[PDB]
Amino acid sequence: VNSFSGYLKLTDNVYIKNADIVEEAKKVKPTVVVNAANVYLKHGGGVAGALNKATNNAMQVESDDYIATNGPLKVGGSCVLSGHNLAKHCLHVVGPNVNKGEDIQLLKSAYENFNQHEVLLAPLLSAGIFGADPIHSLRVCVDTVRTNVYLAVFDKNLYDKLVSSFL
């Protein structure tokens, strides 16, 4: 038993809610919150800007040190950093950004990072301003992630569309 509330059940391991991931994290304090990061860990907008703002820019400061030491991530890759005031850890996962012309096939590789963690609070990778088809991304999530994932969808109309079309 865990502490998430009001989530709709989709498969053996995936739950979904129309919610602000920042507020879900502040409430649950999950072991792992997933950030929809880019390879430079420049947290400007979307999930990343929202999470970083909620940490008072501490996420960005930590991320800049990470990049200075290690260089950029790969599209499809991830790193584990602090969750600051939101979670124990933040798993920064880079899905492909269709608005940058990146390869949508890399979405499955991106979701595979979730399997290294027993339970996660996460956004829908590559959706929103990342420009991929969100129905396709939810499908890839359910068909790739085997650990317990609690998906937070910000946009109400999107959430309703995703639930109503889920197979």
Specify the stretch interacting with ligand A1CKB by CB under 6 A; choose among 70-78, 104-112, 126-134, 140-148.
126-134
- Binding flags for ligand A1CKB, 135-154, as an x/- string (CB under 6 A): ------------------xx
Q: CA-to-CA distance for 154 and 46, rounded, in angstroms?
A: 10
- Interface residue with ligand A1CKB among 13, 39, 155, 166 (CB under 6 A) is 155
User: Are 85 and 59 in contact, with CB atoms under 8 Å apart?
Assistant: no
User: Are 88 and 110 in contact, with CB atoms under 8 Å apart?
Assistant: no
The torsion defined by the Cα of 145, 9, 153 and 74, in degrees rounded to 10, comes to 0
CA 17, 18, 19: angle at the middle one, nearest 5? 100
- Interface residue with ligand A1CKB among 16, 21, 91, 93 (CB under 6 A) is 21
Shorter beta-carbon distance to ligand A1CKB: residue 117 or 154? 154
Specify the stretch interacting with ligand A1CKB by CB under 6 A; choose among 75-83, 114-122, 125-133, 138-146.
125-133
- Residues in contact with ligand A1CKB, counted by CB under 6 A, come to a total of 18
Rg of the chain in Å (alpha carbons): 14
User: For the purposes of burial, counting CB atoms within 10 Å of the CB of 8, is it exposed (0-12), middle (13-18) or buried (19 or more)?
Assistant: middle
Residues making contact with ligand A1CKB (CB under 6 A): 20-22, 36, 46-47, 50, 123-125, 127-130, 153-155, 158
